[PDB]
Enzyme design. Structure first.
Site, PDB file in Angstrom:
ATOM      1  N   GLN D 141       0.836  -1.191   0.000  1.00  0.00           N
ATOM      2  CA  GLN D 141       0.000   0.000   0.000  1.00  0.00           C
ATOM      3  C   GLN D 141       0.875   1.246   0.000  1.00  0.00           C
ATOM      4  O   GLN D 141       1.904   1.279   0.680  1.00  0.00           O
ATOM      5  CB  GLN D 141      -0.944   0.005   1.212  1.00  0.00           C
ATOM      6  CG  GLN D 141      -1.703   1.296   1.450  1.00  0.00           C
ATOM      7  CD  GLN D 141      -2.405   1.463   2.770  1.00  0.00           C
ATOM      8  OE1 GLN D 141      -2.195   2.414   3.534  1.00  0.00           O
ATOM      9  NE2 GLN D 141      -3.300   0.534   3.096  1.00  0.00           N
ATOM     10  N   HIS D 143       1.133   5.708   0.083  1.00  0.00           N
ATOM     11  CA  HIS D 143       0.771   7.080   0.317  1.00  0.00           C
ATOM     12  C   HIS D 143       0.953   7.866  -0.990  1.00  0.00           C
ATOM     13  O   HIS D 143       1.990   7.709  -1.631  1.00  0.00           O
ATOM     14  CB  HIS D 143       1.629   7.746   1.393  1.00  0.00           C
ATOM     15  CG  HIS D 143       1.312   7.263   2.778  1.00  0.00           C
ATOM     16  ND1 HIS D 143       2.155   7.468   3.844  1.00  0.00           N
ATOM     17  CD2 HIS D 143       0.242   6.583   3.264  1.00  0.00           C
ATOM     18  CE1 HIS D 143       1.620   6.935   4.928  1.00  0.00           C
ATOM     19  NE2 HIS D 143       0.460   6.397   4.607  1.00  0.00           N
ATOM     20  N   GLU D 170      -3.234   5.447  -0.812  1.00  0.00           N
ATOM     21  CA  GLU D 170      -3.908   6.311   0.140  1.00  0.00           C
ATOM     22  C   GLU D 170      -3.471   7.759  -0.038  1.00  0.00           C
ATOM     23  O   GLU D 170      -2.266   7.997  -0.144  1.00  0.00           O
ATOM     24  CB  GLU D 170      -3.600   5.842   1.562  1.00  0.00           C
ATOM     25  CG  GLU D 170      -4.061   6.748   2.683  1.00  0.00           C
ATOM     26  CD  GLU D 170      -3.692   6.180   4.041  1.00  0.00           C
ATOM     27  OE1 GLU D 170      -2.777   5.335   4.092  1.00  0.00           O
ATOM     28  OE2 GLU D 170      -4.311   6.567   5.053  1.00  0.00           O
ATOM     29  N   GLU D 221      -9.751   3.092   5.621  1.00  0.00           N
ATOM     30  CA  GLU D 221      -8.815   2.376   6.477  1.00  0.00           C
ATOM     31  C   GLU D 221      -8.639   3.053   7.825  1.00  0.00           C
ATOM     32  O   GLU D 221      -8.483   2.407   8.866  1.00  0.00           O
ATOM     33  CB  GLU D 221      -7.447   2.290   5.778  1.00  0.00           C
ATOM     34  CG  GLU D 221      -6.302   1.821   6.667  1.00  0.00           C
ATOM     35  CD  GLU D 221      -4.989   1.741   5.917  1.00  0.00           C
ATOM     36  OE1 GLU D 221      -4.361   2.792   5.647  1.00  0.00           O
ATOM     37  OE2 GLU D 221      -4.583   0.597   5.616  1.00  0.00           O
ATOM     38  N   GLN D 296      -5.315  -1.955  10.225  1.00  0.00           N
ATOM     39  CA  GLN D 296      -4.023  -1.317   9.996  1.00  0.00           C
ATOM     40  C   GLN D 296      -3.306  -1.188  11.329  1.00  0.00           C
ATOM     41  O   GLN D 296      -3.735  -0.410  12.182  1.00  0.00           O
ATOM     42  CB  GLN D 296      -4.165   0.059   9.342  1.00  0.00           C
ATOM     43  CG  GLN D 296      -2.866   0.849   9.321  1.00  0.00           C
ATOM     44  CD  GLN D 296      -2.958   2.103   8.483  1.00  0.00           C
ATOM     45  OE1 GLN D 296      -2.179   2.297   7.543  1.00  0.00           O
ATOM     46  NE2 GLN D 296      -3.911   2.977   8.810  1.00  0.00           N
ATOM     47  N   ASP D 335       4.962   2.681   7.562  1.00  0.00           N
ATOM     48  CA  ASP D 335       4.332   3.794   6.878  1.00  0.00           C
ATOM     49  C   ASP D 335       4.592   5.122   7.570  1.00  0.00           C
ATOM     50  O   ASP D 335       4.019   6.116   7.129  1.00  0.00           O
ATOM     51  CB  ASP D 335       2.816   3.550   6.790  1.00  0.00           C
ATOM     52  CG  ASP D 335       2.135   3.419   8.137  1.00  0.00           C
ATOM     53  OD1 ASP D 335       2.787   3.069   9.133  1.00  0.00           O
ATOM     54  OD2 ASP D 335       0.912   3.635   8.261  1.00  0.00           O
ATOM     55  N   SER D 362       1.528  -0.370   4.988  1.00  0.00           N
ATOM     56  CA  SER D 362       0.215   0.253   4.880  1.00  0.00           C
ATOM     57  C   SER D 362       0.440   1.763   4.675  1.00  0.00           C
ATOM     58  O   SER D 362      -0.131   2.622   5.340  1.00  0.00           O
ATOM     59  CB  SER D 362      -0.660  -0.014   6.092  1.00  0.00           C
ATOM     60  OG  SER D 362      -0.077   0.555   7.244  1.00  0.00           O
TER      61      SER D 362
HETATM   62  K   LIG Z   1      -2.287   3.557   5.496  1.00  0.00           K
END
Ligand SMILES: [K+]
Ligand code: CNC
Ligand code: CNC
Ligand SMILES: [K+]
Lengths: 551, 178, 137, 551, 177, 137
Positions: D141, D143, D170, D221, D296, D335, D362
């Site tokens: 995942q 950003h 995200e 999330e 998460q 993250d 994440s």
């Molecule tokens: K995240």
């Protein structure tokens, strides 16, 4: 137009590293090559007639050495018939005891055990390695070198390293003829830092053995073996000369291990079309067959070779696992530079650091890498704090600890002063108080006064040509105001009389207490069993600088 | 083609020369060292530092091993002065001496990428001094912790390629330089 | 016959450890070193000690280590310079077949180093086959 | 007199990080605290009367929710009676199937499963994680943000991201009023990069669902839960309001997970004297009780809290393992910045990368950290090359891949254009052609022409104010000549209608092919089983930039 | 010691103020923000920014929660403008307003170590600007990826301490600076 | 009852799926979107679809997730702003007990959301005791 994104990336240090596409016909492939031989063994009247595809008629010296002395022929047929996947599962199964596995692995052929560990991913290998490691307690080895062969600095760096936790320390020379001084400086400073630390001075084979015979070292490690016959030959040895050398060190009561490492036969021009891992397994079996207790491997100085190709760092972990699985002490490299990137070198080291091996590194640099005479280690003295923090973050015993500046200054100072007295007492070129002071506060040879090299080397050589032995160092210490240190020196000379530290994974801890795989049996059985970071040692590891009381 | 093989080298009879022993692919299949310095320039500077000192430079090509120690040994055997300089195509250099173990040496240059044409001329210079029995101060150390990360795989490959020209049992050929 | 239970010898059986010159562990003190009541030539591990360690290695499941120690026990009788001569003689292209057998015969007749003698004869045979004798390069 | 060794060390980046000594009383301890409650449970007629030392009379809302919905009471007594050490052994034992373990772990109380995993070292935890991870295939995942909340950049980046391999992306906003714009840029760009990539925009709870009701997102999330009742209240929720919200997302056909992470309660002032890991376990049980599919965690935004104390990064891997052991999807942090040192952050990340999780990170930052609106990620765009080299080094699938400049530049162009067309097609502040080209070769916002953020901030609040739905975006696309993307953005809305991607670990790959724990079953049983990096994906991972052919 | 208690505050009734609500230790058990900018200085600079726009500045201390969003929410209900400023002892600051969900805001300063008295002044002004229903440009973003690595543990500790002064149901006392 | 072998419905049984105006997955094409043969009320997941996924979740050993989807299925009947009102009412200090029991009653009788209604009543009781009702701050 150029992507600004790709332009930033291009600047990253990792892109300065050497990468190559695999070159299978030349063995420039880390593991799992289609040219590797399928595992096999045939035996007639107690002698091997075929080994991993090859008939005895075509055996080279390595095949011969391995087939005759490297494998338990009594069970080889049985274990060959076992499922390699099942065997790899046993390796990482926490409930299959190391003692149930070693009788099987020592009956495997080189290709068999390579086939076994090749079924594994690095997490499984690490799960296996914490179990197969011979000594219950993991340890660490450092390099202590400098560009000038300055003996003062070597003794101080050695005492700091011993104080930080290294149980073995290794020096070598920028100038060959300096060797006797480096060795004695390393030995003296190590003893001042922690009595029991073992020292070695890596030289030309005949030269190093002679130096050990003079009493100026505690062990030898860089006793090389190689995995193809032409390469071994350019290495100026055969399995029989190196096996005789091994027994020669033992006959003088000195601990030794062999050295090998994936990628050496590629670097030296003859891989015979085989992967690095498979050729490294042959080296591991040459070690076993010679009856050498231990081995430095995990590519070591050729790390740029497997690291350049796919799965090379996995391969590095795999060769260390094979070493431990075959019931050999593993001094697991992490001592040589292969990358410009901190991220990358960190991934390479955690493979051994997280599970723990007999020596997590076989040459952490206890000096800044500019002073590293093995052309740089994977970790150096400027990484000490990071290493301690990671120990604390993960609750992993990496064999080192946080230390106070005032303690390190005093220990370094005492080591410089002890060596001052040795030199004065033995009539060597003096060590001045100024020199003692600089070594005290030094980071590296940049902080040290230049010495008169001609004078040093003339007296260093007379040590050799006049056989000035280890007891001369003892006496100078005793007579020169350093009785404690003299006693510690004599005590480590006395270890050479009992043969106790010749055993698998031997180090010397506490008050002259040998600690090996014989009396420090690895008894891993899963969570909450085996060696665990805890109690006072955990407290010691947790106390990093910078951690202030929340209150 | 600045190198001509003129015959199997014979031993020197006076301490008046230094032998330069080069690898079986020197100035042939390979023509520059690992960092692109021409073999032509390298030999010229080595030969100049030698001659510089009032000593003869004799060049031979060695075949029995591509290992730089053994290449040098093949040279020291023949050197009337007992001193030799071994050089691989990739540039790795050693100063050797009749009498030493193959893996021992007078001076070693184990990080070829750091060598310059100047280093090369200093190396011939000192070999000549060794031949003259003076005790020259060593050519100053060159070291860099990133030389292996940057160049060791390329070194491995250039050595694999030169090694294909090894011939077991073949005696060294004296070389005519253009 | 020594077992793992008898290891370490310095802790469990220090008296089992003596030197060639019959000195004891406790004989090696700063004061006897300083008086030269003991010297380097007293500080040598014995064949006795190495064969005990060989026995312990075997007991620990390490047969080839034990065999290395048995060779070592023989070699304690061989002077340093001869050790180095024999090591060098075993390296590639140093020796003729006959010189190796002479070393093997000498090891045996002069030193009773019969395991090492077999080891050297083994090498000579294979060195012929693999061409690692003087003149094979 | 200062030691220059220590002066050198004092300058290392790791020494700028925040470290503290443990403060038990204020729960400033990552795990294994003597304050943590001993595991227990009492059940009367199918309902819990005692939970981990606490009687029901004293239960807080979290206790009630977990006791009533979060534990399998059918085997709770049986599992409680089992030895924790033995259960930890089962966790990492390759031969105890995930399916045998899940009915027992989900019957454990929070203190019980904390007690279990606390028996493990990080190697065992990793050995366990690879087995317990719900989805067979690991993922990643990213950003996608910038400090200017620049929508044109966001699309460009989003598109690169998807092309590199991220399966979820995200976004967020420095200026909350900006929200609708980012969301739509991430969405479009993600589908340009790869159709199926799921997108979210993380905001205040009520605001985000509205965003999702509108069709500008495909999942959520950052639906927060907390491990103490005071902290949960300052978080402006209860277990029931968050559970209501979870089902609210599902009723609109949107995938969602909760977010938690060790150290939040400490950061927010009320740890009730417990360890971070025990409080995080309560958070993991809240998630499970709510019937939310995934979570998460791994400290996420409060990573400087467990990282400041001993065994904090181990605690983070342990909270991930509990998550997976409880049969929830785990998006495992990696993250958020916690350190100045590359060595350190690499150790923290390998804990999840080596075994693999449902989402290894994440929120890998798919932009340089200056542009990272979550106050920096543990990895950023400048690390892409390092991350690919380490995958190749270890034969580990980290979910990403080496990519071509050409391709990337192309990709980002087709996204800024799309958004451009889109942006005018809704009559919003048009995307200038100078804006479109810049964003094609940008690395960051630093390379972007400044924008009119109060013009945009007006229109942005407008979308939400005048409830302009995702069809308006679908219309401006195709009507800008963007067939595919309008289509692809339809197939996302189609997946919403089927509910298939609402399940545990669901992502959408290939031709809108859902990949979840239900159809991508993790069947790990030791070496040569379970997910194995091989075939074309291995080829893809091997083919890194810079690899020279030996030839 | 710059803020005097002075009776429990009350509603404004006019868009000509700006309330400054501080946590239950501001200028009390804690006297500077997370990097040492004293409590006196920071207040003075925001008060300055408010009035320069022509707005009246009020100051109250909140007691029901140490959470900056709720602290600011407490005063957005007392502010005749409907706009407020919440500022934690460690320094974190938010620009709030009645009608907004509590965890939402007009502008947030989520990284206190990056606030200067420059920044604090500029905030009062955007707070005054919103108050006249003017549309101020949002104060330029400050984002430092190393802000958390350096200060998050410290932040946690400072907040743990400020929280010991939270008093359930207690109403915001007025504040004479 | 749908089963794991029934999943993904999109591949195995797409005809089991439909929409907030009932059509089929085939029908959601851009053509129909432009022509508005397909609109937003044609693109909302149905309760029926969510009950199928609930049964599959149950079959996959995830009972709580199933419970999640069954509540979801009920909430499909509640209008968007009403969902938000009810979410906000369940947040700390927002409501009176009386208020929450009204929502519950409303959920049951207006929307037949029997599970969510029970959910809310549960909250109300516990909110009293753990004091998160309006005025409890
Ligand atoms: K995240
Ligand atoms: C890699 C390495 C290095 N090695 Co070795 N080594 C090797 C490996 C490769 C050697 C090879 N022939 O392919 C490896 C592990 C097998 C090895 C082996 C040996 N090494 C040896 C020694 C002593 C040394 N090695 C160093 C050069 C020690 C180096 C440390 C240092 N300070 O440089 C070193 C760590 C790094 C060199 C490098 O990567 N350069 C970068 C590369 C891009 O340049 P390059 O010019 O192509 O490098 C070549 C040379 O270094 C050469 N080489 C390496 N070691 C030696 C030793 C000798 C005597 C000679 C002549 C050449 C070499 O091989 C490299 C690859 O072809 C040394 C300086 C380390 C030390 N100080 O202890 C030292 C030489 C001292 C001297 N004579 O002046 C051995 C004798 C050890 C032993 N117990 O047998 C042995 C000799 C074997 C042989 N036939 O060359
Ligand atoms: C750490 C962090 C961050 N958070 Co929060 N957060 C948190 C954690 C701690 C918060 C806390 N209350 O202690 C965590 C995970 C619990 C959290 C929670 C929330 N966060 C929230 C959001 C939306 C945001 N968060 C960020 C500030 C997002 C930040 C990203 C960024 N760009 O800053 C962040 C990643 C980094 C802050 C930091 O470390 N600063 C360094 C520190 C030394 O400075 P400091 O001044 O002491 O930091 C304090 C403030 O940042 C405050 N804070 C953090 N988030 C918010 C949100 C709001 C509304 C307020 C008023 C304050 C905060 O908590 C910090 C520690 O006390 C945000 C910019 C990133 C994002 N979109 O996710 C965003 C705000 C968007 C905006 N308003 O423009 C939530 C509402 C999310 C939700 N699902 O409900 C929620 C608010 C809870 C609450 N009561 O504060
Ligand atoms: K070493």
């Amino acid at each position: 137009m150029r992507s600004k994104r790709f332009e930033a990336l291009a600047k990253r240090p990792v892109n300065q590293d050497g990468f190559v596409k695999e070159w299978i016909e030349e063995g420039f492939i880390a593991m799992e090559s289609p040219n590797d031989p399928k595992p096999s063994i045939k035996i007639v009247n107690g002698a091997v007639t075929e080994l991993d595809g090859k008939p005895v008629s075509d055996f080279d010296l390595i095949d011969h050495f391995i087939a005759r002395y490297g494998i338990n022929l009594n069970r080889a047929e049985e274990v060959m018939a076992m499922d390699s996947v099942k065997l790899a599962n046993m390796l990482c199964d926490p409930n299959v005891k190391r003692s149930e596995i070693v009788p099987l692995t020592t009956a495997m052929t080189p290709a068999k055990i390579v086939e076994v560990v090749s079924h594994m991913n690095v997490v499984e290998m690490m799960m296996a390695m914490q179990k197969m490691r011979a000594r219950r307690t993991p340890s660490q080895q450092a390099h202590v070198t400098n560009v000038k062969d300055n003996p003062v600095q070597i003794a101080a760096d050695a005492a700091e390293g011993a104080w930080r936790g290294f149980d073995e320390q290794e020096t070598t020379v920028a100038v060959a003829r300096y060797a006797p001084f480096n060795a004695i400086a390393l030995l003296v400073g190590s003893q001042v830092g922690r009595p029991g630390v073992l020292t070695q001075c890596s030289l030309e084979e005949a030269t190093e053995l002679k130096l050990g015979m003079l009493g100026h070292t505690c062990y030898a490690e860089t006793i090389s073996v190689y995995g193809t016959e032409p390469v071994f030959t350019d290495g100026d040895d055969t399995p029989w000369s190196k096996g005789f050398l091994a027994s020669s060190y033992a006959s003088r009561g000195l601990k030794m291990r062999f050295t090998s490492g994936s990628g050496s036969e590629v670097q030296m021009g003859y891989a015979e079309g085989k992967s690095m891992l498979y050729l490294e397994a042959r080296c591991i079996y040459i070690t076993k067959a010679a009856g050498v207790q231990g081995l430095q491997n995990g590519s070591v100085s050729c790390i740029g070779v497997p690291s350049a190709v796919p799965s090379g760092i996995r391969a590095v972990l795999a060769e260390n696992l094979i070493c431990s699985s075959l019931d050999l002490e593993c001094a697991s490299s992490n001592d040589q530079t292969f990358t410009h990137s901190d991220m990358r070198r960190t991934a390479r080291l955690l493979m051994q650091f997280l599970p723990g091996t007999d020596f997590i590194s076989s040459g952490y640099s206890a000096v800044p890498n500019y002073d590293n005479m093995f052309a740089g280690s994977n970790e150096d003295a400027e990484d000490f704090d990071d290493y301690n923090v990671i120990q604390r973050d993960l609750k992993v015993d990496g064999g080192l600890r946080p230390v106070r500046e005032e303690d390190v200054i005093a220990i370094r100072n005492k080591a410089a002063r002890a060596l001052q007295a040795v030199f004065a007492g033995m009539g060597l070129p003096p060590i001045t108080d100024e020199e003692v002071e600089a070594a005290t506060y030094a980071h590296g040879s940049k902080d040290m006064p230049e010495r008169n090299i001609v004078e040093d080397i003339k007296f260093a050589q007379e040590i050799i040509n006049k056989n000035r032995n280890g007891l001369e160092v003892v006496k100078a210490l005793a007579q020169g105001g350093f009785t404690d240190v003299a006693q510690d020196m004599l005590n480590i000379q006395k270890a050479k009389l009992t043969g106790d530290y010749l055993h698998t994974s031997a180090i010397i801890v506490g008050d002259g207490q040998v600690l090996s795989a014989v009396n420090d049996v690895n008894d891993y059985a899963g969570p909450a069993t085996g060696y665990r970071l805890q109690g006072e040692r955990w407290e010691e590891i947790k106390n990093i600088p910078g951690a202030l009381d929340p209150n | 083609g600045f190198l001509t093989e003129v015959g199997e080298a014979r031993q020197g009879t006076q301490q008046d020369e230094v032998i330069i022993a080069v690898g079986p692919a020197f100035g042939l299949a390979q023509t520059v060292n690992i960092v692109g310095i021409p073999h032509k320039s390298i030999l010229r500077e080595v030969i100049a530092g030698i001659e510089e000192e009032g000593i003869k430079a004799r060049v031979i090509r060695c075949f029995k091993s591509s290992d730089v120690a053994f290449v040098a040994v093949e040279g020291n055997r023949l050197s009337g002065s007992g001193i030799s300089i071994g050089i691989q195509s990739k540039g790795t250099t050693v100063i050797h001496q009749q009498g030493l173990p193959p893996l021992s040496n007078l001076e070693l240059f184990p990080q070829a990428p750091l060598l310059t044409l100047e280093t090369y001329r200093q190396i011939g210079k000192n070999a000549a001094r060794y031949a003259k029995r003076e005790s020259p101060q060593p050519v100053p150390t060159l070291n860099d912790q990133m030389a292996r990360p940057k160049y060791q795989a390329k070194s491995a490959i250039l050595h694999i390629k030169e090694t294909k020209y090894v011939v077991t049992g073949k005696n060294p050929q004296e070389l005519r330089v253009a | 016959s020594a077992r793992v239970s008898d290891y370490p010898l310095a802790n469990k059986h220090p008296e089992w450890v003596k030197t060639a010159t019959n000195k004891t562990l406790d004989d090696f003190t700063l004061e006897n070193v300083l008086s030269n009541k003991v010297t380097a030539q007293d500080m040598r591990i014995t064949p006795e000690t190495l064969r005990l360690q060989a026995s312990i290695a075997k007991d620990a499941g390490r047969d080839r280590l034990a065999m290395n120690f048995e060779r070592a026990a023989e070699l304690t009788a061989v002077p340093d310079d001869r050790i180095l001569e024999i090591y060098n003689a075993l390296r590639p292209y140093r020796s003729t077949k006959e010189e190796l057998l002479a070393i093997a015969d000498d090891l045996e007749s002069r030193y009773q180093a019969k395991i090492c003698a077999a080891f050297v004869r083994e090498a000579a045979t294979l060195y012929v086959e693999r061409k690692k004798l003087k003149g094979d390069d």
